[PDB]
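Submission sheet (multi-component)
Chains listed below:
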Amino acid sequence: ALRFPRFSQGLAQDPTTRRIWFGIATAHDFESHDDITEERLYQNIFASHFGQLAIIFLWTSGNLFHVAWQGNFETWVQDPLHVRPIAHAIWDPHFGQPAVEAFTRGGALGPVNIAYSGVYQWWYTIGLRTNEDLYTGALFLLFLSALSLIGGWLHLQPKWKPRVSWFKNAESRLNHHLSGLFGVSSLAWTGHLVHVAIPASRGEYVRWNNFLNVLPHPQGLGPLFTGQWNLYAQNPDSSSHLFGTSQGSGTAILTLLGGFHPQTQSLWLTDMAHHHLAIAILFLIAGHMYRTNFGIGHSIKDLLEAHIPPGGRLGRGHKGLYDTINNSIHFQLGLALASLGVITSLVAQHMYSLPAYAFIAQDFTTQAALYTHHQYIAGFIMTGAFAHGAIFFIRDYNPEQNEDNVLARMLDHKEAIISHLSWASLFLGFHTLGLYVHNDVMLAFGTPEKQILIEPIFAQWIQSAHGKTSYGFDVLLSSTSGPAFNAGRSIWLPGWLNAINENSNSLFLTIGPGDFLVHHAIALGLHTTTLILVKGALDARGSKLMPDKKDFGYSFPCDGPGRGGTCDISAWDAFYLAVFWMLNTIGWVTFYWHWKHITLWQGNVSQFNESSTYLMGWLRDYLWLNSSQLINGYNPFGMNSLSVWAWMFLFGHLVWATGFMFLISWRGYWQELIETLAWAHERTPLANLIRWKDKPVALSIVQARLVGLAHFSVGYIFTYAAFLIASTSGKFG
Amino acid sequence: DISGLTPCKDSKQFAKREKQQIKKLESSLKLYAPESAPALALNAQIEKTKRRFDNYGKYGLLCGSDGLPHLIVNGDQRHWGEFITPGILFLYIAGWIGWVGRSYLIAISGEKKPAMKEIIIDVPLASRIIFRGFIWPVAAYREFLNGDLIAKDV
Amino acid sequence: TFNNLPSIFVPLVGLVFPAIAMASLFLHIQKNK
Amino acid sequence: SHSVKIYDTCIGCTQCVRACPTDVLEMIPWDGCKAKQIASAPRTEDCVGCKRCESACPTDFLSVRVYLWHETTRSMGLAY
Amino acid sequence: VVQPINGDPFIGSLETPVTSSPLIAWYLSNLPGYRTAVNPLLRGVEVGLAHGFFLVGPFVKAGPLRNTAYAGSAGSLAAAGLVVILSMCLTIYGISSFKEGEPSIAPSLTLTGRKKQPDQLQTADGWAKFTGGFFFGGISGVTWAYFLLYVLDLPYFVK
Amino acid sequence: KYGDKSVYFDLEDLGNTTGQWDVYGSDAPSPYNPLQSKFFETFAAPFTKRGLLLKFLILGGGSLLTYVSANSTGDVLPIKRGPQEPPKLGPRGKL
Amino acid sequence: GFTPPQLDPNTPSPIFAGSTGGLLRKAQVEEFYVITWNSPKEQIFEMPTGGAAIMREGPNLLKLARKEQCLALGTRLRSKYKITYQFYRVFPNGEVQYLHPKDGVYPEKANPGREGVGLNMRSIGKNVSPIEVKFTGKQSYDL
Ligand code: CLA
Ligand code: CLA
Ligand code: CLA
Ligand SMILES: CC1=C(/C=C/C(C)=C/C=C/C(C)=C/C=C/C=C(C)/C=C/C=C(C)/C=C/C2=C(C)CCCC2(C)C)C(C)(C)CCC1
Ligand SMILES: CC1=C(/C=C/C(C)=C/C=C/C(C)=C\C=C\C=C(C)\C=C\C=C(C)\C=C\C2=C(C)CCCC2(C)C)C(C)(C)CCC1
Ligand SMILES: CC1=C(C/C=C(\C)CCC[C@H](C)CCC[C@H](C)CCCC(C)C)C(=O)c2ccccc2C1=O
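Outcome: structure written.
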């Protein structure tokens, strides 16, 4: 490698300008780099993870630093319900004085941006009641970033260079990560919540100078060693507690009273403490499972070779799977992104319903921004999980070493899987679109009594199976005589019932036929994204149209116009079209969320329950109506604080349309156009003196696909962020 | 009275929907003479609406707070007219379509060029088969037991 | 001075770090050994 | 540049090269078929990757096969 | 007179009246972009002076402070900044296109077929001298445009 | 020979064949005055080392930019002038 | 060692009023693929660079842009006009590489004297998976 890509001499030996793009895009595809090994692969991955941790700690330190320096956090602590958060100040020298005047919020002497990230609520719930606290945290996270950087530097040096036999130690790694990185980590978080966050909620500030003296509980560790743990749940902040002062506070540190804090409409800090403690016990116990240097424990290899069902249904079972996962980094990455995306969606689905931060339920833009954020993140992470499974099936899947096992016996009936997922998506799309269209028509014919309104009896049954008496099923928690209600009758169910039955909060919302129909739209989206991704992953090795697809790799443009045509045949293109369907699905999810919640917050749940059953309600009563205060962010006569969100709205529209250029138009019209341009530049006087060094070419097909999707997704995300933030901030209900 | 839904025969908002649609159609009725074709058609649509609302009342449909009939699919015996009886009515016709189509494709499978029979549909053959899907729930069951429903790989 | 750090770091970063970075990276592109 | 390969399932019909617009291919004698000839790909440096060769290969899947690889000025088909 | 370039029909250009004519070719041949034998420093000086005035034009009257009293001064300041950036990009161009000491990549031939000397502008030191001339000439033209807007404001248009 | 009747492939003179021509690159001597040329030579030879020129350009330009933006007041850019206006209370109180 | 190259001389070129699809700077620093053919009469043919040219009676010579241009031209010549053609590659240093038949015979007639390369003696499904050649320069198809 001679030119800029030092990691691929095939792109360095490219006189065109494709090598710049492909040296950007393959920079982090180490197992495709030239003249490397498995040692160097894992070591570069390890140093890269160090860099990622450094960036994460640096970005958190930037958040803390800007909230401390340019924020109003000390003012937000006093009157949080009526003082606006501040992400960071703004020095944009293009600003006009109306814009300097409009962006001055939260009691600031200059322009500012309102923190729609909820970091204020989460820092205030865990202590951190001064700017100096955030400054110390930011400086410590900067130290941690430098620590990660030096660690990743030295672990690249030959003296500290772990071998592949160390990375593949999938039992010591699992034991350590489970026990320490989850159990001890959540245990330390409890040791913060018990020593700092609860005392900071109960009044007194417990800081590094005085945290050894302050007893978290008036009887310190006697109750714990003597087994009398119930002494830690004696005075559980009996319903009159003001978060941040001793009025109506107590002395408990670990409780299971459940439900919400009445002031904050959030979860109790004692519940979080006991929670992280209990799951710490579970993870510290589970991290002593796998065999290590001490003679006891399990070998995952024999756990998999033992889970082969007699009967040959699964065939060879999980035999040879430890070796095909531990050697395959893409399999580890795919499983990891699967779990991560599911738990990210879980974070969203449980932070909207069970907010664990003070005064985040009552503020309404952060609760939407976070949900939308984590759900789009989960959709991307899930698409990536499947894409890396496809990359595994091409690159690291050895069909001989896992013959007739659960994963080759999987690839056998790929046609069955693809066909039945196709059936599910076809069925759902047909039917639910038909019902939305029937209702659109029945409203268009002035006959809303003829609409197909299916009450979601099953979700309403689960709701009534948790204590919601809004339907009258009276089963397993709404029935007082049920043994499930009798078991936890004295533990959590009073708080949980006065929470779930309270129709102001956002857990277990009262759902109706529109919720049914949009849940089926969601199922269509999930099944279809899954179809696209699974089909790409299983046809990654080959199909009837291109059986030697494993030899062309994961990302290749096509196979030519022969055999009828092979546009978008690669598993990369399955990922591609799945990102489209994923954005669509998460858009449905977040549209449903934002409309249900903005109608709840405004008070008119009837708006959703009547208008969500026909698509013109979404186009009128959600998009057209809630975009009223946004697009008026800057009129011909003046502007307001929502000018930035309107500009971002239109910016996202613009790139979302620009992506259609790279998607609709493909390579050949642009190559010819660039040939004309090159002629003109080489025959235009006073510019003949200037000659390019990289011969200009139109973007490669796979590249331009990626670029179109980048513009498309950036526009999707920025547009909906603008709209969501501006609609929920233009009113705050 | 299930799922918190009042029946439509004893709902207030349902009758309000009725009254509102009738007043809407009557506001468009005071512009023509009461014996001409437009007024007669409007009165026919009015009776259509009134009988529609009364029929949705008398069938025991459940009208929610919005005052529109919410169909119950869970399997309640009172609400099998919502999904399960028309669901069987569907699946009987849908399997008719599939079974006559399948027996047609199997009928032309032993042809020299079968594809021309998918373009130029052999109407005598199909018409002799078009009623053979009346008995699909039993013929298909036997073809599944005999092994003739699902093909073998070879 | 803390209010004057915007007057020093933003023109520093968003103009010089592109100068340094894009220049050094163009040199790294146009290199030969 | 591109890596063109001819597999033994060939029938020596001479459509790959007669379709190939850049003289990449050439028929050589062989003993594996009734026609006693098979295609070879010496001039892969001149291979643009247009896959006209394998859009004219009449076999089960293919015998000629073009693998996209290091793209140079002549495989990218540049007059500049 | 649209016959091809040098009568060569398979070269991608033509000797139309716009390209190859006694007036327009002369004009394109006696200006500092195409004065090959002369050293590139004077060429760059001329180029930078001209473009410094051309840039100070649409910064005083067209800009964020055009209507204020800081129109001319701050506009000339922005023009000098754009000139510094243009010398910057010219500099990275000279560094990236040719390294240190290679011969000139310019054509050593001409339309008449004379094996002329290559344009030393395209060399490293030559392009560096050209960039230095461009920067010097451009800052000088910016300040001279500011001077003419200062002392001779009345003949020029204000609007 | 390139000058024959419709011959454009002189294999010896590949420059005339491939089109290597200074289409307007006059080899005419310096039309400038010698004294001003020497003046510019002596006053721009500092900008002869492209690497030192680049370092000087980047560092001095960033320094001048920071100096302008730090010493400039709010009269020349409103972002420094500040609000000079009371802050509006947002919706729902301020939240 | 049976067919020598032809070493195209200073032949005349076709009558053509000049186009813009001709030789750009690629010829001035890289090859430009001269083609030579021999006409029975002064007839008119479409040029691959766009436009109509009038080939001369006898030998002709065209330096167009690249290999595909001259080979497309030569295929149109051989099919439409039934004429022998041969084209070259002219690097800027001076060398002239002979390329189209490379045996005096077009690359359809399997004439012995040409060694088979790009030749995998197997069916196309019997190539190894990438994992079998992971961390090796051989991708999937060179064993
Ligand atoms: C107990 C000992 C121990 C501990 C603590 C760690 C810790 C870590 N290792 Mg491991 N490692 C160990 C032993 C240990 N290692 C051993 C013995 C080996 C031998 C093979 C390895 C081999 C190894 C490799 C090969 C790699 C690591 C990596 C990592 C890092 C993971 C990335 C990260 O920070 O996410 C940590 C994530 C969590 C703590 C939680 C995630 C999920 C929870 C459940 C989500 C929900 C709660 C959420 C956090 C709440 C947020 C709310 C709010 C505060 C925002 C982390 C620092 C990676 C790394 O970065 O390299 C340095 C890596 O590539 N380790
Ligand atoms: C509104 C836009 C839209 C719609 C309707 C669809 C529809 C579909 N896509 Mg998606 N798709 C879209 C945009 C869209 N896509 C975009 C922008 C991309 C990015 C390239 C993709 C990428 C994509 C992939 C990659 C995949 C799909 C799949 C599917 C099918 C999923 C099965 C399903 O729900 O079908 C139910 C049927 C419909 C939704 C069709 C609606 C039309 C009605 C029912 C037809 C009847 C009307 C009328 C009587 C007909 C006569 C009309 C006229 C001639 C008179 C379905 C046809 C998947 C698939 O094929 O799975 C089977 C699949 O793998 N699509
Ligand atoms: C003889 C007709 C016939 C039969 C028995 C089947 C049977 C099947 N199809 Mg296929 N299919 C057909 C026609 C048929 N298909 C046609 C014409 C199309 C083009 C629209 C499709 C497109 C299609 C897709 C895209 C998918 C299936 C799927 C399926 C399976 C699930 C059933 C389902 O969801 O319905 C699917 C039905 C439709 C999508 C609507 C089209 C059906 C038409 C209306 C019936 C045509 C009848 C024929 C013209 C009448 C001739 C009568 C003769 C006497 C002359 C099943 C094996 C799914 C699968 O494999 O999952 C297991 C799946 O993903 N089918
Ligand atoms: C391609 C591929 C891949 C990837 C893939 C993916 C990405 C997947 C995903 C997947 C997913 C993403 C999944 C999910 C799942 C889920 C589940 C399976 C669930 C379950 C559940 C349950 C069981 C529950 C239970 C319960 C309840 C109900 C509640 C309460 C509690 C309890 C517990 C009782 C891999 C790499 C692997 C390999 C290769 C191939
Ligand atoms: C009761 C009900 C329900 C539920 C149900 C269920 C859950 C079911 C399931 C079912 C299932 C789970 C099924 C499965 C199946 C499977 C299979 C595997 C089949 C096969 C078949 C076939 C193969 C056929 C064929 C045919 C026919 C017969 C028709 C036409 C033609 C054809 C040939 C297509 C609910 C509550 C919702 C509602 C109400 C009703
Ligand atoms: C418009 C278009 C072009 C023309 C695009 C050109 C050649 C490239 C873009 C032009 C410049 C380079 C804009 C660059 C914009 C960004 C600033 C670059 C960001 C990259 C940095 C982060 C490195 C194509 O080449 C193309 C190719 C294949 C399918 C569709 C299309 C297509 O739709």
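Remark: The pocket of beta-carotene (ligand 4) is lined by residues A 331, 334-335, 338, 342, 385-386, 389-390, 392-393, 537 (CB under 6 Å).
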